[PDB]
Amino acid sequence: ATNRDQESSGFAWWAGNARLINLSGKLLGAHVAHAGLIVFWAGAMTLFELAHFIPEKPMYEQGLILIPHIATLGWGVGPGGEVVDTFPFFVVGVVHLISSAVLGFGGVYHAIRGPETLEEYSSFFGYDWKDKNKMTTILGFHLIVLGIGALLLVAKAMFFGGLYDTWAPGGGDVRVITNPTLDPRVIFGYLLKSPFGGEGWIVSVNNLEDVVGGHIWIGLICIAGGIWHILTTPFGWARRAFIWSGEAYLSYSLGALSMMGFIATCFVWFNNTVYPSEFYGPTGPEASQAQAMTFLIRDQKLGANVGSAQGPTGLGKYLMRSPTGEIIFGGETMRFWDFRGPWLEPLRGPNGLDLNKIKNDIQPWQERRAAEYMTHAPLGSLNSVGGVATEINSVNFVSPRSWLATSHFVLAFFFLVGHLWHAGRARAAAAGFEKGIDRESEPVLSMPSLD
Amino acid sequence: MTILFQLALAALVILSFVMVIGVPVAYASPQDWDRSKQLIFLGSGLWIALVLVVGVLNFFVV
Amino acid sequence: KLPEAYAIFDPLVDVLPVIPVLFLALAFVWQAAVGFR
Amino acid sequence: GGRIPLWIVATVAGMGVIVIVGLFFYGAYAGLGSSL
């Protein structure tokens, strides 16, 4: 066995995948077999989700996370997000599950049967980690693949059925996007938006014309930079900036993935556009806004004048002003006055929540939505007891938004730790002291004392 | 047909169980590799055919 | 529910998603068989 | 002395641990203590 023990490889069993750093044939097989694990799970989970799925229950009541991802794409859903057909979920699960036997085969093949190194067999599929031009070429190859993937979403939205649109007028529906936002002041304007409250950076994207036109821009940028990296070598400022080794490139992707996981955690928590509340449940802000709506509606039905009702503190019990003066829901939900959702936006005038609209124009579908969202707030226990920590056992609910945000916080945190681990190790390995201090030339011993 | 669907699926499920065990043991026993490769080549194309057969016979049993 | 032709395979579909965890543990069976060398 | 290989012993013992603890988590959703 070449490199499959600690004496020959330098790495113990518990760091045994580091024995593959300079074995590109087996290292390719590790990646292809692991790609098959991802695709296996995407297929197996979907079939599990579909086999447990009740179409007359909402998706968010059923512990589903992958069916809502398919439904948001426009597949299998009708107006308001009701499931009109379970066959697209069955196709997406089956095709992933079959394809993972394919990726599993070539992963197993390259990792046990194929050549341990690809360099002798092929100059095109071989690489040195230190060959900067080969590194940018493969980077360019994968950038093109990702840009085409972003245009696949555009093609779904424009030419192959559309996407589910929670903001579609007259209630949410699958809608073909015809005029995506191509204006770069809007698309790149989200990049300069503050991440703080009321702004929210890219998480604030609130319409599918911005989502589709952004993916047009991303798909063309990734194809352009793909072609750019195939046809260039890193400039001297980048050569003197970075560490050029496999562990270093891993660490850059680790920091990149950690940053993206934190972003997705905030996406699923706050955004009800690309994570529609009919599929994922109400957001945290949404349900708190929906409780204030529920008790405004009930008490105003009893005869209360909700605009003039003073709470215990002297703020309005139902309605109050935000610090810039917009009319907002009172109580603790004053913090969530930046929430925007299709059940609430009909009540909102130019200066905020309109008292005349609130008195007259609250439809029964809004009252049903407010009560349903208030009672499906993303709060629950680890054993999936719905509601506050003091609630009794009965309701079996943890919102998908809570599952998706918490999982991706954990993953993004540990990926930041992995970034720090591998980036520090790659620097020490390139500078040559990752195995410790040379006793015969210890650096501090030739530095002057601090005092 | 209808029996020819749940037969062909359970033939696919059984053959995948022989490919999941039988492929890594054949790849990692380089003793009798030559007779394993035709067995691998055969079961590979038989697996791809049964998937296509189940996928076509999906639509007659709905 | 899965399409009703596939409902025989309902026990098997119920155990499919955990199969990736078994690959993580299989790496330890294999390392134990080679003595964690 | 060394007739059953220790990796086989560890795997069977490790799997029986999983099965027993897995039964304990099953019993959290059935019968006593399940709130139903």
């Binding site: - | 043991v25 003793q31 | 098997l12 155990v15 | 290989p5």
Partner: peptide
Amino acid sequence: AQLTMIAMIGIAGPMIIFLLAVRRGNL
């Protein structure tokens, strides 16, 4: 039903190892 499926799937992993161990495989 699920128990006998998981017991077969759970055996298939360690059976690959055990069979390769006794065929003097490239473990």
